[PDB]
Amino acid sequence: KLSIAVFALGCFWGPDAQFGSIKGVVSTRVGYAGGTTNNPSYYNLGDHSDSIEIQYDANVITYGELLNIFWNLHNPVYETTNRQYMSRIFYLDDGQKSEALEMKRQIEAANGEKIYTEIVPLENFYLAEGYHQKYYLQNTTKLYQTLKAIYGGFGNLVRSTLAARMNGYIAGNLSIASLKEEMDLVELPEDQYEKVLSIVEEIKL
Ligand SMILES: C[S@](=O)CC[C@H](N)C(=O)O
């Protein structure tokens, strides 16, 4: 049992890699939310926004810390009607709602600009296509294939904490030192630890 935040802040690849680099974030998935059609998809998006579902351990990171990361990944100071990329916070309860509203007020005071992020109730979140998940990792072929065999397949891999961290590492959002600690948590057999580590070290160059 973990806590859930659902945010929208533009194309979801960067957010996936950024939030997935953070201690306390257990898993991420990208998808679509905020519209009024069931089962949207990339070429049939309707009025939905590109969104990220963050599953986090509230004992380790708070919703307030996640909102602060959210507002540091983009600066939503213009009003657009482009639903696919609109800045939105989908609250799952009234505590999330009030923390978001308060933090939005603080930001507007501290920097002087109106924030256009819509703070709205989460209705339905729909998972994006598999090719959008852990996008940087998926497109780093050897590392991906190795990790995928270790986790037992695509679904198990992309739902894992280590994939979230690896994806963030490839994207440039996590140090190799922190990544290595994460690899340590998984307790791989020595040989697999070494295969993964040499790919990762080769990526650092
Ligand atoms: C998920 S974003 O809307 C897609 C952006 C585009 N395919 C690109 O590679 O630049």
Keywords:
alpha+beta, oxidoreductase, 205 residues, alpha/beta fold, binds S-oxymethionine, 45% helix, Peptide Methionine Sulfoxide Reductase, Chain A, 6-stranded mixed sheet
Largest sheet: 6 strands, mixed
Number of strands: 6
CATH topology descriptor: Peptide Methionine Sulfoxide Reductase, Chain A
Large-scale geometry: globular
Radius of gyration computed on alpha carbons: 17 Å
How many domains, in number, for the residues? Answer: 1
Number of helices: 9
Give me the strand/helix succession. EHEEHEHEEHHHHHH
Oligomer: monomer
Distance between the termini: 38 Å
Bound molecules: S-oxymethionine
EC number: 1.8.4.11
GO molecular function, one term: L-methionine:thioredoxin-disulfide S-oxidoreductase activity
Protein name: Peptide methionine sulfoxide reductase MsrA
InterPro entries: Met_Sox_Rdtase_MsrA_dom (IPR002569), Met_Sox_Rdtase_MsrA_sf (IPR036509), MsrA_helical (IPR049006)
Your description of this structure?
- The chain is an alpha+beta fold.
- It has a single domain, classed as Peptide methionine sulphoxide reductase MsrA (Peptide Methionine Sulfoxide Reductase, Chain A, 2-Layer Sandwich).
- The protein contains nine helices and six strands; from the N terminus they run βαββαβαββαααααα.
- It has a six-stranded mixed sheet with strand order 5-4-1-3-2-6, covered by helices on one side.
- The structure holds S-oxymethionine (MHO).
Provide the fold topology.
Layout: E1 3-8, H1 13-19, E2 25-33, E3 49-56, H2 63-73, E4 88-91, H3 94-111, E5 118-121, E6 125-127, H4 135-138, H5 141-151, H6 154-158, H7 161-171, H8 176-186, H9 190-204
Parallel strand pairs: 4-5
Antiparallel strand pairs: 1-3, 1-4, 2-3, 2-6
The structure holds S-oxymethionine.
